[PDB]
Tab-separated table of C-alpha atoms and ligand atoms in Angstrom:
chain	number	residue	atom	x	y	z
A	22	UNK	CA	-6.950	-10.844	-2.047
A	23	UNK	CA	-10.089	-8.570	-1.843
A	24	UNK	CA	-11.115	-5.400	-3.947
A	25	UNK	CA	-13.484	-3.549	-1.751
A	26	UNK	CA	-15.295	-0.997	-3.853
A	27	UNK	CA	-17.758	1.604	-2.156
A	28	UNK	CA	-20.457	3.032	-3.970
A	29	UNK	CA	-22.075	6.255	-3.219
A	30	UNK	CA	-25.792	7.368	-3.445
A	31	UNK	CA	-25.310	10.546	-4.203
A	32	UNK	CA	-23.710	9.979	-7.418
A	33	UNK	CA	-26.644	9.760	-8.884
A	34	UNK	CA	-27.253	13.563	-8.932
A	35	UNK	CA	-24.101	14.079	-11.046
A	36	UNK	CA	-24.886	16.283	-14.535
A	37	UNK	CA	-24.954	14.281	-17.437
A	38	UNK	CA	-22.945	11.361	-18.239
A	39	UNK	CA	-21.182	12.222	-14.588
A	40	UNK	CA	-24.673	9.860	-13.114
A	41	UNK	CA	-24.134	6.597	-11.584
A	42	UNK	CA	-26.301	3.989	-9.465
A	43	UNK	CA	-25.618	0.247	-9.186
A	44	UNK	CA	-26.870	-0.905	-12.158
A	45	UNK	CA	-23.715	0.790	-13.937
A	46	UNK	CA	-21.310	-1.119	-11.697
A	47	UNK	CA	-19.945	-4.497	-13.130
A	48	UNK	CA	-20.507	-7.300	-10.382
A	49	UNK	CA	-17.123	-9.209	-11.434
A	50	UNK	CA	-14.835	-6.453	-10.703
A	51	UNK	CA	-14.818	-6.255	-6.699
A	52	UNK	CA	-14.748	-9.190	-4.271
A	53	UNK	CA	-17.452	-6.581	-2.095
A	54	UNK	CA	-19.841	-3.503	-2.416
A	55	UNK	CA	-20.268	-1.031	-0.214
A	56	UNK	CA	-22.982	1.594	-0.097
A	57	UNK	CA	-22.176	4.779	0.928
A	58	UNK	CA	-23.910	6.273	3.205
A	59	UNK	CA	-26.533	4.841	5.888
A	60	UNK	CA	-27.277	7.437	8.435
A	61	UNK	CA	-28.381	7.651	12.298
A	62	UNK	CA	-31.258	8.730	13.692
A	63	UNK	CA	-32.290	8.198	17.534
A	64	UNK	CA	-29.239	6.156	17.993
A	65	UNK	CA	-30.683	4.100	15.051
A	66	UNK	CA	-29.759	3.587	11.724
A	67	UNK	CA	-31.252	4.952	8.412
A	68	UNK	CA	-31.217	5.781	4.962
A	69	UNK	CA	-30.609	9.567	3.843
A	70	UNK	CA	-32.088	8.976	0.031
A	71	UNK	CA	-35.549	9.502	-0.922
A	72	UNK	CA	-34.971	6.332	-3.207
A	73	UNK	CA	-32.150	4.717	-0.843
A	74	UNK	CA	-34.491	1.678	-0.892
A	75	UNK	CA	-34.663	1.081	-4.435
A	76	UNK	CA	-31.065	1.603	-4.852
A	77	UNK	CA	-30.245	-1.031	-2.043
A	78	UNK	CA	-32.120	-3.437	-4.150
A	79	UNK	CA	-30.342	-2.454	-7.219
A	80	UNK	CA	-27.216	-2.619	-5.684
A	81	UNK	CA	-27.536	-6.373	-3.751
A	82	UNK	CA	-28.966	-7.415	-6.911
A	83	UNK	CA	-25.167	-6.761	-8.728
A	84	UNK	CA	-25.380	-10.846	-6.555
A	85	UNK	CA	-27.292	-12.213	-9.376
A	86	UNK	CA	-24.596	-11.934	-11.423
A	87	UNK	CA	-21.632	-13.036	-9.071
A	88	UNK	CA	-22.169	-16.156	-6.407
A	89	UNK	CA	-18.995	-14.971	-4.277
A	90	UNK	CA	-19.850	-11.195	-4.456
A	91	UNK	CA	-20.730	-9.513	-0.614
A	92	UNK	CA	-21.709	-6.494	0.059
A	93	UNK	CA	-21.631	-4.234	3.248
A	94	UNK	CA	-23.201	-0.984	3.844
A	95	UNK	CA	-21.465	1.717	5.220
A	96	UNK	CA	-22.818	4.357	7.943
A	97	UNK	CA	-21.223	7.719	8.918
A	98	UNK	CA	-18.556	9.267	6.520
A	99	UNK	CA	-16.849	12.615	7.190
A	100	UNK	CA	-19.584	14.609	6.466
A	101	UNK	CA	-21.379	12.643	9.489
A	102	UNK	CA	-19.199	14.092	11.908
A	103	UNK	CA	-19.009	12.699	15.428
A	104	UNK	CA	-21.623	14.327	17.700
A	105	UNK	CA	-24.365	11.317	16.453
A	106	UNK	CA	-21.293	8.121	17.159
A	107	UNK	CA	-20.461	10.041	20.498
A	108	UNK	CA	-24.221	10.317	21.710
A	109	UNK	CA	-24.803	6.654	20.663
A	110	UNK	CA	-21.582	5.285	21.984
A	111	UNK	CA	-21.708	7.154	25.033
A	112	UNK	CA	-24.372	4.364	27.208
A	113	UNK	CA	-25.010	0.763	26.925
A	114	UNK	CA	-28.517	1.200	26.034
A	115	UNK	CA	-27.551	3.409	23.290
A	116	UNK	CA	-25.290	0.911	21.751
A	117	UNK	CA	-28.027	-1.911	22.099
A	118	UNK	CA	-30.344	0.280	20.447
A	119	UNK	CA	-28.039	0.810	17.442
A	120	UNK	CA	-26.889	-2.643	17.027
A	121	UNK	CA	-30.578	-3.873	17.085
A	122	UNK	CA	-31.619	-1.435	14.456
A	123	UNK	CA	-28.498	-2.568	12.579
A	124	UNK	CA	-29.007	-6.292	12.755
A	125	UNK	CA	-32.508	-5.445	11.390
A	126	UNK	CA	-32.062	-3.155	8.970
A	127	UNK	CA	-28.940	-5.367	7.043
A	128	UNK	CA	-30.879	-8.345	6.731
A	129	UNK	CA	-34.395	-6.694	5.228
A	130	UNK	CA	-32.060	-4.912	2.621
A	131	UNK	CA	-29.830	-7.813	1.665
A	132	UNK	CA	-26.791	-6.888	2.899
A	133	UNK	CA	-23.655	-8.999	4.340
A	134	UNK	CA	-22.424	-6.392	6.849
A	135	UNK	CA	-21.665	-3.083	8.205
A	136	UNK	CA	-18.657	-0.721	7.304
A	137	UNK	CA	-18.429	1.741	10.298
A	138	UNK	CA	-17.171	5.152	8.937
A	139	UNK	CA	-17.014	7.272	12.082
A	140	UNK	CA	-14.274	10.077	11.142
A	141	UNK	CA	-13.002	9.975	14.122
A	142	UNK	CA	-12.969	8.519	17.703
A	143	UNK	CA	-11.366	11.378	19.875
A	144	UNK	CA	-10.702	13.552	17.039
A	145	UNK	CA	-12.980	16.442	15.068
A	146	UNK	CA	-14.776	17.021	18.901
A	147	UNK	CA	-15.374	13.444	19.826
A	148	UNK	CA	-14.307	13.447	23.376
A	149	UNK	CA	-11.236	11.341	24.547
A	150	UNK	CA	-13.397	8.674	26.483
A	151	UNK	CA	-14.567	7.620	22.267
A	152	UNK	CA	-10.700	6.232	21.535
A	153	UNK	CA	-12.329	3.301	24.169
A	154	UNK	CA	-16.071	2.918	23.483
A	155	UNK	CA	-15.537	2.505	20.132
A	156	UNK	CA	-13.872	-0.605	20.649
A	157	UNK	CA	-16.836	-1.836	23.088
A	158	UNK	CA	-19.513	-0.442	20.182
A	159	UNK	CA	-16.916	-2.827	17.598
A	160	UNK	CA	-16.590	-5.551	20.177
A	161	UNK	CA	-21.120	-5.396	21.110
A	162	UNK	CA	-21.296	-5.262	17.736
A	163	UNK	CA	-19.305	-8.136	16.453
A	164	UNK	CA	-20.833	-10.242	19.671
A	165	UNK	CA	-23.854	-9.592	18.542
A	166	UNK	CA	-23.846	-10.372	15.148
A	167	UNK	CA	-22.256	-13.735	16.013
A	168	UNK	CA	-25.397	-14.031	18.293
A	169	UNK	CA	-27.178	-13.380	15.232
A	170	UNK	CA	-25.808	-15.639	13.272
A	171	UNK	CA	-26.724	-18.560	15.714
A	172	UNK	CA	-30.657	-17.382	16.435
A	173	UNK	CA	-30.690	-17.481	12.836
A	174	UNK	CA	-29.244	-19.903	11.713
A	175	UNK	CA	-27.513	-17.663	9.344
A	176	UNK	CA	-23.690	-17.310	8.310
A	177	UNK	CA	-22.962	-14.137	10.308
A	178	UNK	CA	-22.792	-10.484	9.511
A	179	UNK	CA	-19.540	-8.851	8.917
A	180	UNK	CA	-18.371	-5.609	10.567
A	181	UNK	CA	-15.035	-3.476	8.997
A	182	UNK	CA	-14.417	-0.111	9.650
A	183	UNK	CA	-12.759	2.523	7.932
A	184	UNK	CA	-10.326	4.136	9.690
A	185	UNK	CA	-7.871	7.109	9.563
A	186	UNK	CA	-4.661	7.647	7.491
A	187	UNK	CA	-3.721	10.595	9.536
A	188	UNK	CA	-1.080	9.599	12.383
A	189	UNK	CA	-3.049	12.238	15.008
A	190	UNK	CA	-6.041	10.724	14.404
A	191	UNK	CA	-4.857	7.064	14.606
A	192	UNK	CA	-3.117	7.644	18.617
A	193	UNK	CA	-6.446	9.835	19.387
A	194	UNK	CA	-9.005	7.193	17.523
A	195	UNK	CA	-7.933	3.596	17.534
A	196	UNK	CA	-6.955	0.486	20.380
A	197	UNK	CA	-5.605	-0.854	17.728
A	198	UNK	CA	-4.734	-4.753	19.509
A	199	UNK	CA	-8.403	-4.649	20.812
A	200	UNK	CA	-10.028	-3.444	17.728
A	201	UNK	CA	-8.494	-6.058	15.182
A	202	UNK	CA	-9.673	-8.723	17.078
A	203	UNK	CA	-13.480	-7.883	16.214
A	204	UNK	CA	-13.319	-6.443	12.619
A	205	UNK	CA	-13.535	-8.970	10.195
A	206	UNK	CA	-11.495	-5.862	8.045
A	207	UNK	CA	-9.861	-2.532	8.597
A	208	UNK	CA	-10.050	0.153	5.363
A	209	UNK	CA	-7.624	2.330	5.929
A	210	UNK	CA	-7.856	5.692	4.368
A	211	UNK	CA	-4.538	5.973	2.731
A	212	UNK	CA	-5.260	9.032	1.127
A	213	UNK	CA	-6.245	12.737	1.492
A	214	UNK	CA	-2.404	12.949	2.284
A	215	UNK	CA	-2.005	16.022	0.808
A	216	UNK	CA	-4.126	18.847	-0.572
A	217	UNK	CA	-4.867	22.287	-1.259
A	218	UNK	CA	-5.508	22.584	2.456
A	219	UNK	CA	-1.386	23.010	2.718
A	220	UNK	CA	-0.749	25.545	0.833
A	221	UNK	CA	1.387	24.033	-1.473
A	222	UNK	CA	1.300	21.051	-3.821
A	223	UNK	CA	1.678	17.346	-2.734
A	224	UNK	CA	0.343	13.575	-3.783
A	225	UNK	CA	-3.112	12.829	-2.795
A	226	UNK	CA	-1.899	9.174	-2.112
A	227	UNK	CA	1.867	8.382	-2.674
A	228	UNK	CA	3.083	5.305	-1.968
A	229	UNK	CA	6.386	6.908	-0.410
A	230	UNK	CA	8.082	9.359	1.603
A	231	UNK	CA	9.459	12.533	-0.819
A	232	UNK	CA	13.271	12.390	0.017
A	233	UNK	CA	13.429	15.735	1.912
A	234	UNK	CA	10.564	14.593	4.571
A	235	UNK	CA	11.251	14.355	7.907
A	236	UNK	CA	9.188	13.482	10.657
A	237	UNK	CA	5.558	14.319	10.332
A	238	UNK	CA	5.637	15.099	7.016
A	239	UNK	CA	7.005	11.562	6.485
A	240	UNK	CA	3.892	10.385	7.798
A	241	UNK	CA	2.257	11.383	5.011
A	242	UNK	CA	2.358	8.352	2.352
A	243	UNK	CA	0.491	4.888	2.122
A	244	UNK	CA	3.946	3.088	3.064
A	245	UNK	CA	3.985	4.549	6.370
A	246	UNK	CA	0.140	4.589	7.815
A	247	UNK	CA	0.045	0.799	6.591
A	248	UNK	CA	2.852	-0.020	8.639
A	249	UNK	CA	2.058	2.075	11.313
A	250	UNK	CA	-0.814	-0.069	11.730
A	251	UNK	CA	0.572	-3.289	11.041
A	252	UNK	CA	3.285	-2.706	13.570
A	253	UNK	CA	0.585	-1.397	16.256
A	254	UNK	CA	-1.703	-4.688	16.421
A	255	UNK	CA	-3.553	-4.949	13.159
A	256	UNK	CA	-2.764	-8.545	11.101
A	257	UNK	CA	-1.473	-7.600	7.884
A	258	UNK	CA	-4.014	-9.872	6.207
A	259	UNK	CA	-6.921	-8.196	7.893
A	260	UNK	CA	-5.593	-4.691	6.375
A	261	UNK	CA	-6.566	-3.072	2.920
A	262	UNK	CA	-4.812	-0.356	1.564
A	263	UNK	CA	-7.067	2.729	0.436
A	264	UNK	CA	-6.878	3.459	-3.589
A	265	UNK	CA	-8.377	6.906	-4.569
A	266	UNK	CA	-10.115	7.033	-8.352
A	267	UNK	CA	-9.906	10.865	-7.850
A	268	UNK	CA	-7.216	13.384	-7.376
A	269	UNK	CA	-6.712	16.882	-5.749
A	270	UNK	CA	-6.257	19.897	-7.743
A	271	UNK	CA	-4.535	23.307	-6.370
A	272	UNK	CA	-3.869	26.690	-8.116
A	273	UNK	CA	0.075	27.291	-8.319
A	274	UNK	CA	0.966	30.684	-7.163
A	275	UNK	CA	3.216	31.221	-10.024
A	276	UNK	CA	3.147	28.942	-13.016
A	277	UNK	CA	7.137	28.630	-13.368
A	278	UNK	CA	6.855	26.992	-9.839
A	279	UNK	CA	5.136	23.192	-10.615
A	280	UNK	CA	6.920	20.516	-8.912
A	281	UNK	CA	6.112	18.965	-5.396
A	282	UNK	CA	5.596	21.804	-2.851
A	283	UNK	CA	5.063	24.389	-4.785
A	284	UNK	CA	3.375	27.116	-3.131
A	285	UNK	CA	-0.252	27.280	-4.067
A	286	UNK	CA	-3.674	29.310	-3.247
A	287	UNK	CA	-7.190	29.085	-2.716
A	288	UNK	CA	-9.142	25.377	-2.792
A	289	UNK	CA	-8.139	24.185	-6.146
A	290	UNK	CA	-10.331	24.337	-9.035
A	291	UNK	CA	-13.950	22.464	-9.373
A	292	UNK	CA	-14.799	19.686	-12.163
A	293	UNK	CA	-18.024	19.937	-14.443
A	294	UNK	CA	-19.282	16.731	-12.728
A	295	UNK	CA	-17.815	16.414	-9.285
A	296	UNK	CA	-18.692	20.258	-8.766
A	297	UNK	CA	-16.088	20.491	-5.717
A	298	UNK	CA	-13.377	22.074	-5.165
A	299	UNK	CA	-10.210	20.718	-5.252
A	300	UNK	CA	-11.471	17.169	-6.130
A	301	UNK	CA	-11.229	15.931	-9.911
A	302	UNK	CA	-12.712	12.453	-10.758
A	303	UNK	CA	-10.550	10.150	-12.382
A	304	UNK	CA	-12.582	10.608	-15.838
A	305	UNK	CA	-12.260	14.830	-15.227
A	306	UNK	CA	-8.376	13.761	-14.849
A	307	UNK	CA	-8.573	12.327	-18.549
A	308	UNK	CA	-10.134	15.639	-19.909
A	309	UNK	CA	-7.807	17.489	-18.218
A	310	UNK	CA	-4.528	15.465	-19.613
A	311	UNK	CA	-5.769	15.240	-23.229
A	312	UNK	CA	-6.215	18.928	-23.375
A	313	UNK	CA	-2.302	19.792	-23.419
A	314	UNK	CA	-1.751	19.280	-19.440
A	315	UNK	CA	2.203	18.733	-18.770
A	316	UNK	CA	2.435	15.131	-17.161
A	317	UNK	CA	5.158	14.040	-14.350
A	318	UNK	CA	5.972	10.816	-13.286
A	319	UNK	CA	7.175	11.465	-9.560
A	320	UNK	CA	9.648	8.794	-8.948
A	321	UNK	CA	9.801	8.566	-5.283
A	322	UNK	CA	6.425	8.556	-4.432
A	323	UNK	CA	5.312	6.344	-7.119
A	324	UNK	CA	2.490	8.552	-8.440
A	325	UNK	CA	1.661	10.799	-11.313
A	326	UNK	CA	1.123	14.493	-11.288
A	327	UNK	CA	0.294	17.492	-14.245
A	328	UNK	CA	-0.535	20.738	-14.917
A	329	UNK	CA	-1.458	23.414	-17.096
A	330	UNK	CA	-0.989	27.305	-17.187
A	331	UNK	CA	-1.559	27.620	-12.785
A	332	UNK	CA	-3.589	24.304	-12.207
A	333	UNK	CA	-1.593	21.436	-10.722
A	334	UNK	CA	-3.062	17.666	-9.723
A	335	UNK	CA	-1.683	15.023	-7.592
A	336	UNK	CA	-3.662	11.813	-8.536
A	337	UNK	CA	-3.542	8.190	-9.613
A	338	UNK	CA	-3.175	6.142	-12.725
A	339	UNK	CA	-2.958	2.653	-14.145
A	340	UNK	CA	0.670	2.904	-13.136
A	341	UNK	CA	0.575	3.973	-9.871
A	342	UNK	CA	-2.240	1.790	-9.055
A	343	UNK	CA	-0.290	-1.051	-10.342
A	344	UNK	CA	2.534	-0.681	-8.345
A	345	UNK	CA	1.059	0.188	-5.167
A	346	UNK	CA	-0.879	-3.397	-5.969
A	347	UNK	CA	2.072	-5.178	-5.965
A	348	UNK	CA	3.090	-3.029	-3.127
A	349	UNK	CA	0.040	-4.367	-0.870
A	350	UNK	CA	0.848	-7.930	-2.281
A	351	UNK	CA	4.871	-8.481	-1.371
A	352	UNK	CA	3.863	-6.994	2.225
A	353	UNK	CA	0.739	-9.720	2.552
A	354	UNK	CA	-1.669	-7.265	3.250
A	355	UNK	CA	-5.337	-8.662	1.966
A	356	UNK	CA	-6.347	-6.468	-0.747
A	357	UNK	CA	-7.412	-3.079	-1.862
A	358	UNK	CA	-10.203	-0.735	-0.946
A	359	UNK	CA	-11.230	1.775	-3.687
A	360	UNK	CA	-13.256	5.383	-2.831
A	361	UNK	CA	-14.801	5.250	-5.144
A	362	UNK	CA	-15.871	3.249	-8.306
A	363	UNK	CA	-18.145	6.371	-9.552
A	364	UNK	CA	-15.422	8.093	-9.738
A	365	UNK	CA	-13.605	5.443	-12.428
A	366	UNK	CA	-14.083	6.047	-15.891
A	367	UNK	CA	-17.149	3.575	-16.083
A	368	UNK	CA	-18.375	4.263	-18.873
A	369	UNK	CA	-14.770	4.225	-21.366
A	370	UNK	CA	-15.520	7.479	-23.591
A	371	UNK	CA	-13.065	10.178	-20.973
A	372	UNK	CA	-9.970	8.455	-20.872
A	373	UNK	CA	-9.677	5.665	-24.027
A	374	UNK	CA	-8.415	2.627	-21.603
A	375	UNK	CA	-11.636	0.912	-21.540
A	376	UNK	CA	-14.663	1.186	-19.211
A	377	UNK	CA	-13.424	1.175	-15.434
A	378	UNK	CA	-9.562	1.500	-16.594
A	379	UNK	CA	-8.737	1.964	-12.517
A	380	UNK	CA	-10.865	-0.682	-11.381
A	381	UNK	CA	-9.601	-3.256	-13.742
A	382	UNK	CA	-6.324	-2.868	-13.253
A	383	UNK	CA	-6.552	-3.614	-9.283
A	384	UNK	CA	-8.894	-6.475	-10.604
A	385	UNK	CA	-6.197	-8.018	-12.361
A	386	UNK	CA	-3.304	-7.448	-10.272
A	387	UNK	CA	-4.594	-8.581	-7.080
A	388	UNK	CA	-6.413	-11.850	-9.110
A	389	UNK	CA	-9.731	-11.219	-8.246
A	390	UNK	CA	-11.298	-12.407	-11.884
A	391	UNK	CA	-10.470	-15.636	-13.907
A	392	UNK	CA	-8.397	-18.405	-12.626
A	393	UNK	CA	-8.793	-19.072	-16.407
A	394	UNK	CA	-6.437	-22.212	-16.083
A	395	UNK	CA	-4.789	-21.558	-19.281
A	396	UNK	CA	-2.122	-19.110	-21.173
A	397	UNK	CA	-3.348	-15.409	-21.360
V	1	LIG	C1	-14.752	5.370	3.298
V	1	LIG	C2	-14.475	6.893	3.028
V	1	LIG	O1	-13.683	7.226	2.180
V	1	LIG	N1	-15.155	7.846	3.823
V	1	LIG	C3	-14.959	9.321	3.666
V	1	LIG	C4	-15.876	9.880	2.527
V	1	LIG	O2	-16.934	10.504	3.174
V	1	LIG	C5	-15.145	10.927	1.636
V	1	LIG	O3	-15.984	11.269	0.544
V	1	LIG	C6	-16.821	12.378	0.679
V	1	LIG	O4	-17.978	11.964	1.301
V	1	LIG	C7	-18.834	13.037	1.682
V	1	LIG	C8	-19.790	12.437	2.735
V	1	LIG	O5	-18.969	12.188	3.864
V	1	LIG	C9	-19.484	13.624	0.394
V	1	LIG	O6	-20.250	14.718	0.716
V	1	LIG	C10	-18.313	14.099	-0.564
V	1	LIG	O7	-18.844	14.411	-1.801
V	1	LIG	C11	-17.233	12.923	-0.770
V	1	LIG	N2	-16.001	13.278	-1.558
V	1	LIG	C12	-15.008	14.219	-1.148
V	1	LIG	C13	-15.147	14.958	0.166
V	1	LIG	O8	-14.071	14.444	-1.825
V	1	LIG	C14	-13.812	10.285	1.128
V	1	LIG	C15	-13.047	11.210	0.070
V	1	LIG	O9	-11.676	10.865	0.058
V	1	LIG	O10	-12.931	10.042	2.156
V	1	LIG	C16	-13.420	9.658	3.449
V	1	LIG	O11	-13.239	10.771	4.212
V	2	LIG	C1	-3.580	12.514	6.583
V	2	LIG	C2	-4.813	13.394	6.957
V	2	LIG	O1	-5.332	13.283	8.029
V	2	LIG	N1	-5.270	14.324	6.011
V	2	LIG	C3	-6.409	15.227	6.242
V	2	LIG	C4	-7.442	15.115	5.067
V	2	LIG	O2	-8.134	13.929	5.221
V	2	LIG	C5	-8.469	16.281	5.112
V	2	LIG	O3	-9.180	16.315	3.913
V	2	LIG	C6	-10.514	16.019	3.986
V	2	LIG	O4	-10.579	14.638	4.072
V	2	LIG	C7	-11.874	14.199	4.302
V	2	LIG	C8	-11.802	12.759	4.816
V	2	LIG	O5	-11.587	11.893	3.728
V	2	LIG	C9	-12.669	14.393	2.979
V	2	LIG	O6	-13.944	13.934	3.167
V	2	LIG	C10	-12.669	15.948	2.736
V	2	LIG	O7	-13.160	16.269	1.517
V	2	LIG	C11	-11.224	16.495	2.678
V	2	LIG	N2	-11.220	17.964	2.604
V	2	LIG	C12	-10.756	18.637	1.445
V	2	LIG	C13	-10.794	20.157	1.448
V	2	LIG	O8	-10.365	18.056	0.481
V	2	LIG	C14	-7.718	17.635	5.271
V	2	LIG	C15	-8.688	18.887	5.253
V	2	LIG	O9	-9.648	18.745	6.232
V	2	LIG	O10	-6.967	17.619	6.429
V	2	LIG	C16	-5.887	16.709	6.343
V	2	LIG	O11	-5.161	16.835	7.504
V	3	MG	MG1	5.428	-4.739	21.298
């Protein structure tokens, strides 16, 4: 299996003991790194970070200490938008012009490949014609990095995507058959499944239906989106299931009403660190819980939620983590994408189950560490 861990550069700017570059991620826990975010400029890619550079060293450095380690770097994100992928996609000079600056820019920096993050073919005003160029760009692109690979003499450069969660997105986005014959990987975003955004309370990634959803609302869990691409093209083993290390906060409308659906207002509440709203970090979870929060297990969704007074959280723990790991294992899908390991209590001292509590436990479950050949 694979643990795919994504990194972000802008966690850096985070207050106090909220800051986080590469040098605080342990190279043993993921199979593969990847940097978030490279950007686009004149259908070419770039950083966005005045010290980008350095931290791209830092970061392909983590190799030193782990011969099987990869990393890819990953360009776009939702913030990105579309209007940059659409432009570049659009002609097949464009594309030629991205895929060269690509090719250039991965090998000067020491990476192993490119994560495409374009949020999302057809959808958020990408026109329709996008569904289909992007799987030329994915198709140029993985054609060319074989080419690559034999002018260089060099094992080639890998190209994944991560792709939507969202059923409307998937039919508007995604050739699914063509696609998964070019990505080396497919991340699927198998969370943001519910959210303030609603109006009422849900699971930011549960692993099942609730029993009263019906169609699209039934959409809305990691079972479903994984099997809605499995079924539509995608080889199970080239699939990874999304894992979020943060959780979505909401303000109940009345107190008294706290289980799933309740009807909520507003964006949800911001964290010191993460200074968003309606986004908690997994170590602004533990603050949150050890104060006096009341803690649910939500049976059939396989996920954890709390509250106190009128805030409410759908998130993730070491429990549902481990069972949606053995989830992705019995269905032979290969491995487990996390957004993102800043977000993990990295350093221990928030939630008392060790430093990168989240983390470990997919490292474990999903074998990525040891082979210790003895009794543990
Ligand atoms: C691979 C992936 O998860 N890509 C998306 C991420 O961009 C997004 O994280 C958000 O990234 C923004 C840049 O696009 C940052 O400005 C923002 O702080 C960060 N976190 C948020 C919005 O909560 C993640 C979050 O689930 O999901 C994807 O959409
Ligand atoms: C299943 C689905 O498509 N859910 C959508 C959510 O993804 C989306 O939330 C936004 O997700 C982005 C992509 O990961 C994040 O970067 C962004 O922070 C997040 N927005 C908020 C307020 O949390 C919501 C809202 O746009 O729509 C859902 O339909
Ligand atoms: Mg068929």
């Amino acid at each position: 299996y694979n643990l795919i861990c994504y990194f972000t550069n802008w966690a850096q700017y985070r207050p106090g003991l909220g800051s986080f570059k590469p040098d605080d991620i342990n190279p043993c826990l993921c199979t593969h790194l990847i940097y978030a975010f490279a950007g686009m400029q004149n259908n070419e890619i770039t950083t966005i970070e005045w010290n980008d550079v350095t931290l791209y060293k830092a970061f392909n450095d983590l190799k030193n200490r782990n011969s099987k380690l990869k990393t890819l770097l990953a360009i776009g994100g939702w913030n990105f938008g579309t209007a940059p992928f659409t432009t570049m996609v659009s002609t097949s000079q464009n594309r030629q012009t991205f895929i060269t600056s690509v090719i250039k820019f991965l090998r000067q920096y020491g990476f192993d490949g490119l994560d495409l993050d374009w949020e999302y073919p057809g959808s958020r005003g990408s026109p329709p014609q996008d569904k289909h160029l992007f799987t030329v760009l994915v198709k140029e692109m993985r054609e060319a990095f074989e080419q690559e690979a034999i002018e260089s003499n060099r094992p080639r450069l890998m190209v994944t995507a991560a792709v939507a969660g969202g059923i409307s997105n998937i039919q508007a986005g995604y050739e699914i058959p063509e696609l998964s014959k070019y990505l080396d990987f497919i991340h699927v975003m198998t969370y943001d499944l519910h959210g303030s955004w609603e109006g009422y309370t849900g699971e930011n990634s549960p692993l099942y239906k609730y029993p009263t959803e019906t169609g699209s609302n039934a959409y809305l869990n990691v079972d479903y989106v994984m099997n809605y691409w499995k079924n539509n093209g995608a080889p199970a083993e080239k699939l990874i299931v999304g894992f979020p290390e943060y959780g979505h906060t909401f303000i109940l409308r009345n107190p008294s009403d706290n289980g799933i659906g309740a009807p909520t207002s507003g964006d949800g509440p911001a964290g010191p660190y993460t200074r968003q709203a309606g986004f908690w970090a997994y170590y602004e979870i533990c603050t949150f819980l050890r104060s006096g929060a009341t803690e649910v297990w939500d049976a059939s969704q396989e996920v954890p939620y709390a509250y106190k007074a009128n805030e409410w959280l759908g998130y993730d723990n070491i429990k549902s983590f481990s069972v949606k790991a053995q989830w992705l294992k019995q269905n032979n899908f290969g491995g487990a994408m996390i957004w993102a390991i800043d977000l993990d209590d990295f350093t221990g001292s928030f939630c008392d189950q060790g430093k990168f509590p989240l983390t470990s436990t997919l490292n474990k479950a999903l074998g990525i560490s040891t082979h210790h050949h003895h009794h543990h």
